[PDB]
């Protein structure tokens, strides 16, 4: 773990702060139900299985919650919200093999021989339009994010 290493103790005071206000009891240590309760409040809603997994990634001393350290290396993973959209972020580089920042019809042909989805000449230009809204023939990551969302 290199999160403190990382930040500076301006930052770090300002975690100290999101550690606080975040446990509820105030016992200066995080639980499942006390993770349960906060993360709730961003609009999710997880079970004691989840964030016990959530405890034991960064629980270094191994006794099932969380301390101010294990908070640093948790909260900094947690500040992605669904953080699979780097993922698809990723995605869009195999998707863009020129790497211009912009998917066209030939471009879904050489990423979809490798998917093993091999699509035709026509069937990759459908899937442009399936996303992007302006009808240019180029999908960047505004109009590309739309398929990603759509799912
Ligand atoms: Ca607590
Ligand atoms: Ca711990
Ligand atoms: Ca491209
Ligand atoms: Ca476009």
């Not at 773990?1 to 500076?8: C, G, P």
């Not at 301006?10 to 240590?29: C, V, Y």
């Not at 299985?49 to 405890?55: G, P, S, V, Y």
Request: charged share 35%; no cysteine; net charge negative.
């Amino acid at each position: 773990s290199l999160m403190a290493d990382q930040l500076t103790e301006e930052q770090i005071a300002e975690f100290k702060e999101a550690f606080s206000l975040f446990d509820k009891d105030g016992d200066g240590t995080i639980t499942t139900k006390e993770l349960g309760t906060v993360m709730r409040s961003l609009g999710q809603n997880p079970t004691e299985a989840e964030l016990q997994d959530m405890i034991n990634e960064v629980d270094a001393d191994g006794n099932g919650t969380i301390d101010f350290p294990e908070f640093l290396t948790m909260m900094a993973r947690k500040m992605k919200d669904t953080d699979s959209e780097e993922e698809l972020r990723e995605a869009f580089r195999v998707e863009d093999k020129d790497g211009n920042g912009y998917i066209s019809a030939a471009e879904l042909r050489i990423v979809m021989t490798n998917r093993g989805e091999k699509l035709t000449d026509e069937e990759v230009d459908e899937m442009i339009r399936e996303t992007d809204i302006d009808g240019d023939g180029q999908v960047n990551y505004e109009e590309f994010v739309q398929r990603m969302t759509a799912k």
